[model samples]
Target: ILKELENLSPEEAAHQKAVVETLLQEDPWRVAKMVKSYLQQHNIPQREVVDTTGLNQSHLSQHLNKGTPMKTQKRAALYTWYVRKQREVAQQFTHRNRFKWGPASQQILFQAYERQKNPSKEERETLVEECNRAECIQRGVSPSQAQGLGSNLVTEVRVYNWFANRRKEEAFR
Candidate 1:
């Protein structure tokens, strides 16, 4: 192929080069991996990628897992969307930590600290109930075990961490 390109006239070589570029972009599995990596590196979920790109979820999966090529138009659309999203991500804080504290985070921290301090017997019971509620609300917690939830798993430290991370995720959107 290198020898063939070398023997070609300048115009033909340029056209051949363009064809090669398009062919490389047409690769099914390679493009799928690129898309997948972009999604994961930026912490964007698969559903969000599909929704924003208007790409079918099942087709994305097939391209990724089965080495099935998409139509050229769809491939072009995916690459265009991916490049634009890359630019959008780059415009955000390039090296900033999402969990960094802000004014609202400070208020949340203060509230957590006060909430975890000394409490009456009734207050302790209420705390346990809230802990149980949180546990049940989260996945992987059984309803029966939710009743025996303790302060150990649901403390000021945990609440602050959770709040900070949740705020960070919401900010990402």
Candidate 2:
């Protein structure tokens, strides 16, 4: 399952596989394991990881103990911070050249932001669809099966990472 997950293109799918696998394995400190892996991959210290991810030391330690795990939202934030920061470092993008900042794109972004902040099951699906459309429109691509970052490997990796881990984090929700 882990091997299969390693090939997943969407981060969210891979993350779900991991979370479900952890639950199946009954690893007591799975959340901590994920967090620790993230920290080590990014070469971040515990203190810095907490500061950047907005997870406090006491609570993080609690997660380590399975004393109490971090909330889904907090876990999402940690995963997001780690992926986003690494992505930014891996490649820089101040803005896209010839970017056609259209109303559709703006509306999509706003809707995605708002709905993602408080998404129902249906709305979450809609958000993903709309965000994909928005991404394509902004980048001047057609909405096709290869709809993701396409040639932009760095962006694709980060997006996949965030999507995957965020899904994992949301499992506890």
Candidate 3:
């Protein structure tokens, strides 16, 4: 992520390798599964993926057939489209799933993502506590502004859900 800002950390370089690893495949059957899954998850027509990648349809049928083999050039082109499409879908998810989020609670969530993608139950409990505690304060709760239009506190489900989605978005971002 810091690649553009300055230098890549060993951790992110590994992550970058993970990204590159997805693109470096020669086994037709193995490679086909990811593209197939990507299409299914995106609900995108195969025609669009193929067209965008400039891959041959005739080849692609056997493209899924075992031992057909794919060239490095084709793999590069296919993954280019794959990455582009998913990032759009990732951003699309943000616009579509509109929800309430407080700055403080988001602060909590960001740290959670920063600390760990898959947090433990105890960690989750702490997260909810901090998240709800901070979120309520942001509502400007006081005797003068009592109730502050409700707690505005995040729930366990909300906190956990936020962590998961944020984790997913981390890659695309």
Candidate 4:
């Protein structure tokens, strides 16, 4: 359980472990239930996840029975697949439900992602703001107005800010 909880932050580890431990007590079928839930939440299919991780349903069933920890590679594959599924689902949701905002807002957000590829905090902000400003000016707005477009601009910064960061992290690995 501790091993399974390793990737979780201190705050989440306890709760996650308890959940896993409880499922294990309930039997392999319950473990399958957890896997099913996790896959559905991430928009992945049971068969696809099993295929991608090369973990036969029976092997996964065994882990469910014993509450054994997953191998590192398996965990990594699952995490990658989950993130991919999340991106797909999120884009679908956005396409179906996004506000009718204009291109300026979109460009401002895009620039934020592009800006951080640079070094130096000041330089990065300048680059981000510059990219933001260009879009504003293209619409005949002043630089000051462009700056405002980026104000409180990065949406869901927890995820949005980390989009490029996570990609870079995976690339480095």
The best candidate in terms of lDDT: 3
Tens-digit lDDT track of model 4 for 1-173: 11333344685556554554454454444445555555433223355657766776666545544566666455445444544443332222222221222344455545555655434454545544554454445434344432333222223432334444645666644
Tens-place lDDT per residue, model 2, 1-173, is: 11223333687556655654544345446645765655443334466557766788888767754657556666666555544444422122222211122344346545444456444445545554555565544444444344233323123233344445555666644
Which stretches of model 1 miss by more than 4 angstroms? 1-26, 93-173
Error of 3 at 10 (Å): 15
TM, every model: 0.39, 0.31, 0.39, 0.29
Per-residue error for 50 in candidate 4, Å, reads 1.7
Winner on lDDT between 3 and 4 is: 3
Candidate 1 residue lDDT tens string, 30-144: 7768776655434445565577668898987687567786887666656656654544322232212122222333454445445654444444444444554444343223352
> Which residue pairs show backbone clashes in model 2?
11-160, 11-164, 12-163, 12-164
Q: Which ranges of candidate 4 are over 4 A from the true structure? A: 1-36, 41-44, 64-66, 94-173
Q: Residue-wise lDDT of candidate 3 within 128-168, one digit each (tens)?
A: 67755564454333222232213243557777777777767
Candidate 3 residues lying further than 4 Å off, grouped into runs, are: 1-18, 25-28, 65-67, 96-173
For model 2 the TM-score comes to 0.31
Q: Where is model 2 more than 4 Å wrong at Cα?
A: 1-31, 65-67, 88-173
In candidate 4, residue 44 scores what lDDT?
38
Q: Report, for every candidate in turn, its global Cα lDDT versus the true structure.
A: 0.50, 0.48, 0.58, 0.46
Local lDDT at 136 for model 2: 49
